[PDB]
Nucleic acid binder design. Structure first.
Lengths: 116, 49, 134, 51, 52
RNA sequence: UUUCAAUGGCCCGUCUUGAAACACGGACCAAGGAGUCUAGCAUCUAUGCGAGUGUUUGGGUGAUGAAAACCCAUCCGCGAAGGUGGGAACGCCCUUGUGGCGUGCACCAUCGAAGAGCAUAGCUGUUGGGACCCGAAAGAUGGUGAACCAUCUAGUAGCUGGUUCCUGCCGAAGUUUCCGGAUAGCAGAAACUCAGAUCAGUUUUAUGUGUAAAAUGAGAGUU
RNA sequence: UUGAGAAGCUCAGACGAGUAGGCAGGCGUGGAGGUUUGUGACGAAGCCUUGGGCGUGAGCCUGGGUCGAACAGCCUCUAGUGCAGAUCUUGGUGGAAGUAGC
């Protein structure tokens, strides 16, 4: 049982081509969703900062975005992560606020029945 | 009579934890010297440039 | 035994070509010694640190005057020492960190060709070597 | 290393132009036929197909 | 001047890259040997070919 | 070139055996045909950088094949954690030469208590992997009508037989010694320090055959 | 005096068995990047030949005859690269033999 990496330049170009069709389908929105900033859970890397999965419910409510719409404007949700330190709430709320600063939202046509 | 066998298990963790921070510090300390230890401009090399 | 370098650095076959003439046309032992060490393998030419050179010239009674240290091999620096002294050094290679440190505060660095045109007979030169054990 | 400070730019018509460029620092770097060989030797095996 | 750099400065486009520094400065040996500063100190010259 | 004349020369390879004797293998010709590919380790050398080092997991990019080249973000791996004398080299001389006065690298003695790697390529070595090539009844699974078939299978070997061009240099041992071995020894290969120094399958002189101190030669000793 | 492929040229002396084994320089095959502004229907490659040469040698260059569409020298890269044997694999072919014989 042996594996060869001859398709390594083939697979990389397939991935790039897979990104370009995604960009074609969804033009204005970025090819990647926003991710939060979290700290690795170990004494070795705890002083580091990296990306998370999504923004917890305290990070959404504090920033001012409901949890239902957040999934629609590209902000992802992590029901499992929680905020134990306020610096973790702060680094990710401002991460949301800077995102909503640059976020153009296209209006959608809405059904308007004659009566009500 | 010493700690525990799994308490010496953490002895690597108090040995390996200060690896990443040491390595990151070595990266910036090397770069800091690089800014310091650079050759001056040689003002005679703009005669033609 | 050794009378042709195993190297293929074309410029080392020009440096040897200069010190083959000097060794056989002068009566100095500095040239006969320099030529021999241009034949030595990379293993036999240890790096010699700047601090080790700084200690050797400024050793015991100091009185460095303006002697030129000569070593066949690299001269890597020593960030563990802050104040480098004035030094005139000749070597095959420097390290960009070291060569800047010599140049920035003090004298100058030289290649083996610039030493030869100044002291073809080894006139007032210290010939050092790095620690071989490694 | 002292050599040829300036190079002359030729127009489409073939006549020299008064403007000039300083010879880049790269154009004095060491010339190593052995080092180019043992690198081209390797780098040329990189577009190979397996049989 | 920006893709390769110089032996002192660094290429703007190739990070932290300095051009190589050579074993010697004057690569012309016949000038190194046949210069005054060496030819004034060498001892006498023998014949190029010694008669039998 | 064929032939003759005079002088000559027991069939080649293997194996055996000091050697042969042998026993093998050889009807002839052509073609095919056997240290290879790979991961790990150590060594030597070459190259790049050097207290650092390593772009190729991946991303960026590449309009003229775009599986190449070119570029670097976050990690990560491997490294990083004083006197005395002998000394290489140099200067000052100065009766010069001779030597002295010094400065003293590597290192070694002594008293003592100013990092050298990392990565790539090669060479040779070693361990695995089908493992230089060929050859031992298999066994197992599953089928077909005790027999037979197909695969697992590159099952197993200390053994057998074979292992392919030229020239040049060096060239043993063929066995002590303890104990299948670790030693040694011989041969090398490198690094050292000396010829103003040591030596010798040497010979004398002489003291009591040994030992110690003249000739004859050779540079000798280490790791 | 022209004798700097300094990897060159030149001078002197001694030396030369060789298995196991160690070291070094070369010759040859297929293909690969560079090159010879290379060769080829006015004849490539191949083949035979008591033609001529070159090298200690591996090998090489050439003449003639056949032949008919490709090929090579040089610098490097590379490997399914060099045969007299293996009761070696395959094909061919003899003596045995016009024999055993039918």
């Amino acid at each position: 049982y042996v594996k060869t990496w001859f398709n390594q330049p083939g697979r990389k170009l397939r991935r790039r081509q897979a990104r370009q069709t995604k960009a074609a389908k969804i033009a204005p929105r970025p090819v990647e969703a926003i991710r939060p900033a979290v700290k690795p859970p170990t004494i070795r890397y705890n002083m580091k900062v990296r990306a998370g999965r999504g923004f917890t419910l305290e990070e959404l409510k504090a920033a001012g975005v409901s949890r239902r719409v957040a999934s629609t404007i590209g902000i992802p949700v992590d029901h499992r992560r929680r905020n134990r330190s306020e610096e973790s709430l702060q680094r990710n709320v401002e991460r949301i606020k800077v995102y909503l600063a640059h976020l153009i939202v296209f209006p959608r046509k809405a059904g308007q029945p004659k009566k009500g | 009579t010493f700690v525990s066998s799994t308490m010496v298990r953490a002895a690597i963790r108090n040995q390996a934890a200060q690896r990443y921070v040491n390595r990151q510090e070595s990266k910036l300390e090397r770069q800091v010297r690089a800014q310091q230890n650079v050759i001056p401009e040689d003002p005679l090399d703009n005669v033609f440039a | 035994q050794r009378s042709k370098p195993a190297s293929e650095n074309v410029y080392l076959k020009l440096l040897v070509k200069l010190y083959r003439f000097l060794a056989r046309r002068t009566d100095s032992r500095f040239n006969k010694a320099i030529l021999k060490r241009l034949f030595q393998s990379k293993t036999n030419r240890p790096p010699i640190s700047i601090s080790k050179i700084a200690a050797l010239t400024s050793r015991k009674s100091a009185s460095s005057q303006n002697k030129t240290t000569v070593v066949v091999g690299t001269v890597t620096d020593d960030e563990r020492m802050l104040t480098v002294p004035k030094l005139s050094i000749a070597a095959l290679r420097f390290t960009k960190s070291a060569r800047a440190r010599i140049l920035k505060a003090g004298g100058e660095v030289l290649t083996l060709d610039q030493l030869a045109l100044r002291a073809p007979t080894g006139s007032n030169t210290v010939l050092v070597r790095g620690k071989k054990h490694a | 290393a002292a050599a040829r400070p300036t190079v002359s730019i030729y127009n489409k018509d073939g006549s020299v132009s008064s403007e000039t460029l300083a010879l880049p620092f790269v154009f004095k770097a060491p010339i190593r036929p052995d080092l180019v060989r043992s690198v081209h030797t390797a780098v040329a095996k990189n577009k190979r197909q397996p049989y | 001047d920006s893709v390769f750099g110089s032996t002192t400065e660094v290429a703007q486009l190739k990070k932290n890259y300095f051009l190589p520094e050579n074993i010697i400065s004057n690569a012309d040996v016949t000038r190194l040997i046949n210069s005054d500063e060496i030819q004034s100190i060498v001892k006498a010259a023998g014949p190029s070919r010694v008669k039998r």
